[PDB]
Amino acid sequence: PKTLTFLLTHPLFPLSRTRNLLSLLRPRLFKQAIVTCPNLPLNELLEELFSIRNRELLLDISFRILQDFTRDSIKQEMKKLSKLDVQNFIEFITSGSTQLFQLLSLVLDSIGLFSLEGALLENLTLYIDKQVEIAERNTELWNLIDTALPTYTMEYLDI
Amino acid sequence: ISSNGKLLAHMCKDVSTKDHEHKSISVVSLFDDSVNLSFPLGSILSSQTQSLSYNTRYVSSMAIDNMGQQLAVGFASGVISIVSLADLQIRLLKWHIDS
């Protein structure tokens, strides 16, 4: 409704619709509510991110949560979250940007030291190594963007 | 105005209107009519400064002796010139690097 989109444009949205309207919204109104809603709970937002809908909502939700929330809170909520979808998510990242890299940093922080598979970690180190390399070449290129004695000279002239 | 208050010395543009030598310096007495002189800044300045900038040719401060013998001009390039008003001639004082 136009009134609902006007209230999504409106700054204050009191408590309960911010608590549970994401399940009701689960397209256009979805994108509007995610680009603007003043209060958005972490459990529902991380579940929406870890859904595999992938409308560049990766970028959208990641920028939203990194704008509005703290690293310790994201770490604790993703500690509470499930491991299998985390594995599928990091598989999605290594298959196919600073928002998602900070997301990768935070999921590493939440997973800690215990649940690391072998070949998954091998592919992750390979991907991160080649992307560090291309980022280093990119940085050097950007800095490059930001960057007498006539002892005897036999000549001839045209008169 | 000279430090007594008996002389004033000012500049004019009517010789810009009537000459290529542009600004005219004129010094006038106040309570008597003893001294009154007028001459162009083309005669005041040097000749080697005409291939140079308006910073040099921009006069920025005037000072007069209490007798009227010396008139000190100070340009925007930082070089003072003191003219003796008998033979109407210059001596240069060069220290300031700004105006």
Partner: protein, 104 residues
């Protein structure tokens, strides 16, 4: 165009004679794909910049400088992205060593 040394050679020939238009298409291609794995086209831009900067400054004023500012924006975003990527590489190295310690 394949070998970097023959790229230096053909670059010297381009500067002998075209450099503006190839710089423009290289600029548009890189500002489209900043993360292109093919390093050869960045070697093109790198050698062209370390050889012929002055004429790049003195040729034009608008239809080079606009895309130059846009590519500056993209590559400065890459310079922003680098350090947390280095830190993530460090954490992965730590986890690899811990896995090694669990093995042996």
């Amino acid at each position: 165009w394949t070998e970097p040394e023959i790229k230096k050679f053909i670059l010297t020939k381009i500067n002998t004679v075209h450099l503006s238009k190839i710089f423009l298409t290289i600029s548009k291609s890189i500002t489209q794909n900043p993360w292109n794995e093919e390093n050869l086209l960045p070697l093109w831009l790198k050698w062209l910049l370390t050889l012929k900067s002055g004429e790049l400054n003195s040729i034009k004023d608008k239809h080079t400088k606009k895309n130059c500012k846009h590519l500056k924006s993209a590559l400065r975003s890459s310079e922003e992205i680098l350090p947390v990527l280095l830190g993530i590489q460090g954490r992965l190295e730590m986890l690899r060593r811990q896995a090694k310690l669990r093995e042996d």
